Design a protein around this ligand. Structure first.
Ligand code: 1IM
Length: 302
């Protein structure tokens, strides 16, 4: 915010990822204790530091400074936060918590649903159905916070969520240029890149994102979680078929198709997903209600 983090205290250790106007490195802080405040909570402390890419242009710099401004709006346990910045002079940095379990798509991909609940040792690559709910509830809480600020994410998906120790989830936004998730985006020259498989029908037709389209994307993201990210949404359809599907929602003649129920997903939970994909934006559930259902109702056996 007002005072720059001491850049001299960072020791860079490895690359975590690379985006459109910046890249993220793991760093160590030699003495973490004397930097502590309310904005700044083995023996070395690890942080993740985003910096400008080496091919940095004036345009990338501008995008970096705006990113700092945008992220400064956001303070919530389940939204990524800036511990510190270096923007008074070069090189420019954004410092955040190191989330050691990486993005949620890669994390869930490496796990399997538990055969029998709580029968395994710590560390085994298994995850329980209640943990999936807990993961989902956290994303919903993060989205509830964003909705109160009238802040529209525009690209919610597991690939933009981070996983910390003890399964804390934080929503982030890594942009749309990563090689790893290129199949998730539909590109046309001179047009905005679009994650159509997560997009409400009205966005595909009008390109207008709202809190209600964020709810639709949360429905798809929840589907991802319950699939343990084993398949792409609408995976057996082409991009063009997925775009045509939005036209079918528009004409409203009952020919639109939906994501199928995941194996780990009970029918009651799947009805919630379907409500997120309601044709009319007003009928999609608010995040406060999505969170309530995921934190509580979903624990019912009746
Ligand atoms: O998330 C970003 C980009 C960004 C910036 C600084 C650090 C990191 C990281 C990291 C990392 C990676 C692996 C392990 N641990 C940490 C990511 N921007 C952004 C822009 C607008 C809105 C939002 C939000 F909050 F609404 F989602 C987020």
């Amino acid at each position: 915010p007002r005072v720059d983090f001491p850049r001299s205290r960072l020791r860079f250790k490895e690359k975590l990822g690379e985006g459109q106007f910046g890249e993220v490195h793991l760093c160590e802080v030699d003495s973490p204790q004397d930097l502590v405040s309310l904005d700044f909570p083995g023996h070395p402390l690890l942080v993740a530091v985003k910096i400008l890419r080496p091919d940095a242009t004036k345009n990338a710099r501008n995008d970096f400074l705006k990113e700092v401004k945008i992220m400064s709006r956001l303070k919530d346990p389940n939204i990524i936060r800036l511990l510190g910045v270096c923007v008074q002079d070069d090189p420019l940095c954004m410092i955040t918590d190191y989330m050691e379990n990486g993005d949620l798509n890669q994390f869930l991909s490496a796990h399997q649903l538990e055969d029998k609940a709580a029968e395994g040792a710590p560390g085994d690559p298994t995850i329980s159905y209640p943990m999936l709910l807990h993961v989902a509830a956290q994303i919903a809480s993060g989205m509830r916070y964003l909705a109160t600020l009238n802040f529209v994410h525009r690209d919610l998906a597991t690939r933009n969520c981070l996983v910390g120790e003890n399964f804390t989830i934080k929503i982030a936004d890594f942009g749309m240029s990563r090689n790893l998730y290129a199949g998730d985006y539909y590109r046309v020259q001179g047009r905005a890149v679009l994650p159509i498989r997560w997009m409400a029908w009205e966005c595909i037709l009008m390109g207008k994102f709202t809190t209600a389209s964020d709810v639709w994307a949360f429905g798809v993201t929840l589907w991802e979680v319950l699939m343990l990210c084993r398949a792409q949404p609408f995976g057996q359809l082409t991009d063009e078929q997925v775009i045509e599907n939005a036209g079918e929602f528009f004409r409203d003649q009952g020919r639109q198709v939906y994501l199928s129920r995941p194996p780990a997903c009970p029918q009651g939970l799947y009805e919630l997903m379907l409500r997120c994909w309601s044709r009319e934006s007003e009928q999609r559930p608010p995040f406060s209600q999505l969170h309530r259902f995921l934190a509580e109702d979903a624990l019912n056996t009746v």
